Symmetry: C3
Subunit: 143 residues, 3 copies
């Protein structure tokens, strides 16, 4: 499912044809909506990661903003689920995306989510993810 | 605890109040001494990492220094115990602190520790820790 | 002697003697020829990583090149073997040396290898590696 986007990315770099980046971003945007529906938040994680990395190469912040918005909604759902691990892995991707975009308010969103996920993990009693959340927190406050 | 620090960090981004960073640094410096005293080297790892990130923001090298001296003593104890994984994770944090602080001697300390941890890991199982030690070595020598 | 290279590397830092870097590079190049062809792609990964690190310190691109060419042939062999976890760990080290060397061509190599490994992993049905490959792919296209 990711193969066509990975090939198109290599093909756009070597041939210098940004229309191939745009084609792959279209494929990845279709897939990301299909996984946003259905509730496949683990796949949304990786599609949004790949979507944002290609969008960054193309120089078009629009697709970076779509990845942010979809990752933020997947985080809110995964936090309502009380999954915490999915929230952690979702925030990890959003951190890489926010680092690319440079939007300060995405980091603010992640600080609140991590604090809430720490509270769910504290009352659940999962110690290892409690530390993993604090570590991810120290990375967000950097920038 | 961690929750009060994470709340104060968020509260001091929202409210324009760096005193809340200072209050968090004070709590974490208390907890870090309490953890070093108890020998709680796994918590020493996470407190120092959070302390240094909150100290990097606000920009006070003092709390970076406390973090270096405590991590170093936690590393020496973990190396006495022969716990190659723990000293690996402890040096990993000290490398991030020392990169923030910029003191050459903190790197030199890490060079000698990793060589010793390589000897213990060589005579033990030649596991992934063996490559993880030499991998961490190459990162300490670089910058 | 792995330990000898670690010792010489520390020894060249505080004595400021780059002849010890060149001596460790000699020991590591002898060791890589022993390890390669015989196989042991895991040890090829370790010493090539150490070799290129102290070569970067020495300022000599030549040894960065042999670390690259040995890593690339290890990746091709591990890719022939079908060991997709091994090519992942090999490409991870090849990204660090490619960052040091600064040659655009090694990044092109890594993009093609990762696309292949995804295909082998997709037909093998490993799932977790497929995601880990895509995640590493987003790191390679950055730089």
């Amino acid at each position: 499912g990711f193969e066509e986007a990975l090939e198109l990315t290599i093909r756009a770099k070597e041939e210098g044809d940004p229309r191939l980046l745009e084609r792959a971003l279209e494929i990845l945007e279709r897939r990301l909506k299909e996984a946003q529906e259905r509730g496949d938040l683990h796949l949304v994680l990786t599609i949004a990661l790949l979507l944002a990395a290609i969008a960054h190469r193309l120089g078009d912040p629009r697709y970076l903003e779509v990845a942010v918005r979809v990752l933020e909604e997947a985080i809110r759902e995964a936090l309502e689920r009380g999954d915490v691990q999915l929230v952690y892995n979702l925030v990890e991707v959003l951190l890489h995306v926010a680092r690319l975009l440079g939007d300060p308010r995405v980091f603010r969103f992640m600080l609140h989510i991590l604090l809430e996920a720490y509270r769910i993990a504290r009352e659940n009693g999962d110690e290892q993810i409690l530390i993993e959340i604090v570590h991810l927190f120290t990375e967000v406050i950097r920038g």
